[model samples]
Target: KVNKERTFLAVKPDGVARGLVGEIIARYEKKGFVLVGLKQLVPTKDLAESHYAEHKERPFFGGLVSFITSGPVVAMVFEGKGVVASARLMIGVTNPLASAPGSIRGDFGVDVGRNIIGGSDSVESANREIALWFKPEELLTEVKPNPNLYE
Candidate 1:
């Protein structure tokens, strides 16, 4: 049976500034994940702070929040088996320079702080993030995809 796990992903400010939102979305779609929710907005300070709460004690936490709130972000949620892990792989490691060439960060990122995208690091985090970023009504309840992707 398909697991149908869901994940949250965001084309960060740097990615959006560099006009990579479509490329990012295309990669996930091609990988057969279904998009359930999507939106474009500049993150508020409170939202950014909450999103990175795990790193709250780190010295770079403030920078993370500021950067994320600095410009427009494209937030989206995807559904598929193992999508939480799969999405993380697609985005690559936190440091782009250490990422493989085929990954999103490797292709478009140069610095750790400017990695082109961000994704929830685990299933629990994905659920928390999806809830943080989207209202229940904003997400599709009846997601119908091509049978070729699932059955």
Candidate 2:
């Protein structure tokens, strides 16, 4: 049996301002992930600060929090086997210049600071985000057999 994993993914303020939310979500849906939760709004400073708490000690942490809370963003929780790492690969590197050409960042962003998306790279990050952005009971669970399958 395959164990499913969940991850948090979000279109940052830049992506929303640029009108890329739908495009980004479509890519994930097409990749076989389940969109378990979704929201479109500007995150509160407290939320952003806590969401990025792991980076609190970093020099650029303040900039990151400010930028994400400065404008509206689209937040989502996705579920699937290996989805965390897969979504990170889909989002590409934080540095758009170094991202792969076919990836979301590589295709749509130009600057490290204005990258279009952010995704949890590990289970710990995912758990933190899920707790921060969603109520425990808000994360729904339902089974959907793989629609695109090969035997």
Candidate 3:
């Protein structure tokens, strides 16, 4: 059986400093995704390293962790059917120039290095991400998608 899906989405430092937290949350709120967890913190280097551990072998891995830990982050968990994919699409391509006009990256970002937000690109990664960033108590256990939103 298909389960209620969830993904981890984080507003990087640039997004929060630019005051896009509400905008990012609003998009998912409007999309019928439930916010299962939320927190704002300057993540530790180890935390960032853990999150991107899969890419550790790549040359850019060190930079990825450094960028994430550079400033405050608004990390959140969104849950619903197809949220991972929809959330991915909403944020747009890492290369802002390659994203569509309506995408967040396309509309607001001019460079790939400082794109505003990002999320787990798949279910497996989403689960792994959630586990890495949040403790069990931080997330909601219920499957109650808002009635108006599930329509």
Candidate 4:
């Protein structure tokens, strides 16, 4: 059975500043995930804070929120079977230096604090993130993936 899953992914400030938006989008597109929604915006502090609210108690919370709000972020939603998990793998580990060579972080990132991309950690977060970053009208009501990609 096909999962028909969806997930949220964001090209962080560093990624955007470094001109990696197209690279990131192309990677997802080539992986067969369909883009359902996309936009570029500089996040407000409130939105950034909410986005990283799960880390409210963590020491890095402030830095995470501030950095995301620092520049334009390309927030996007993609749909495919197991896309949430697949997206995370493509993003690589938290520390870019430790990520494998083929992954996004490994290929371009250097600093742990400036890991090029961020992805929803699970299905629940994906739903929450999609709602947080995009409105109902901003996303497509119908998404049809190419027939060759799915059984």
Candidate 5:
């Protein structure tokens, strides 16, 4: 059976600043995930901090929150096979230098501080982020994948 799921992803300000929005989006599109919602906005302090709330106790939390809110970020919701898992693989590890070559961050990123794309790591994260970044009216449910993308 098809595992039609959805999750949240974002091209951080650094990604947008580095002209990687298209590249990031392309990776997901080519992965057969559908863009159900898309928006470009500079995250408010609350949103950014809350999005990374799970990391609140980590040493890098402050930096992550600050940087993500610094400029325009392309926050998006994607639909496809258990989006949390699939999107994680496509973006590769958070430490880009350690990621495999074909992954999004591995291909174009160098520093963890400036890593390009990020996505939900699990169902709970997805639910929080999708709700945090987008409103109910902004997202579309019951999507259909293209026949060409399937066998």
Candidate 6:
């Protein structure tokens, strides 16, 4: 078991457009993660730019930004034990083809550039994303054990 306080999860534009939000959320819910916050918004250019600042210099940065802000995305904050690592496992790899079956990516995505999900892989990314997507007042501060009773 872990003691993680929060982590970020997002249904990317493709995922939202393709109607996978419920499917994605269901997986996390079944895994015992708690939803502390949620929002559906079309991110601004500035927001996308800031959220992906680390990848600004990459060759695919422009495409990434364009895709992210192209449509409404469902941003969420899930809290639980070992949420960072566990969430990554639930999301699978960045590339759908490489992702394992039963993972979000494997089940819903078909390409790397258009993967249905995007999330923070480290504490730094999580912090940055949480701040970017939610104001301090938006997040709820409380501790709730796994509702499904799974440790």
| Per-model TM against the reference | 0.96, 0.93, 0.93, 0.97, 0.93, 0.92
lDDT of 2 by residue, 47-89 (tens): 9999888899999999999999999989899888888999999
TM-score of 1: 0.96
lDDT of 6 by residue, 1-151 (tens): 3555579988999999899999988888877788888999999999999988999989888898999999999999988877878899988897898899988888777889889988778877898899999998888877567545544
Better of 4 and 6 by lDDT: 4
Mark the 10 consecutive residues where model 1 has the least summed lDDT: 142-151
Local distance difference test, per candidate?
0.92, 0.88, 0.89, 0.93, 0.88, 0.86
* Cα lDDT for residue 109, candidate 5: 88
Q: Candidate 3's residue-wise lDDT over 1-151, tens digit each?
A: 1337999999999999999999889988877888999999999999999888888999989888889999999999988888889999998997988999888888889887788998998999999999999999999988765566655
- For candidate 5, the 10 contiguous residues with the lowest summed lDDT are 142-151
Instruction: Please give the lDDT score for candidate 3.
Output: 0.89
Give the clashing residue pairs of candidate 4, or none: none
- Candidate of highest lDDT: 4
**What's the number of clashes in each of the models?**
0, 0, 0, 0, 0, 0
Consecutive 10-residue window with the lowest summed lDDT within model 3: 142-151
Rank by lDDT, highest first. 4, 1, 3, 5, 2, 6
Give the candidate number with the greatest TM-score: 4
The alpha-carbon deviation from the true structure for residue 54 of candidate 1, after best TM-score superposition, in angstroms, is 0.4
Q: In model 1, where do residues sit more than 4 Å from their true spots?
A: none
| Cα lDDT of model 5 by residue, 1-151, tens digit | 2546788999998889989998888878888888999999999999988999988999999999989988999999988777789899989897999999999888998998988988998988898889999999999866776777766
Error of 5 at 70 (Å): 0.7
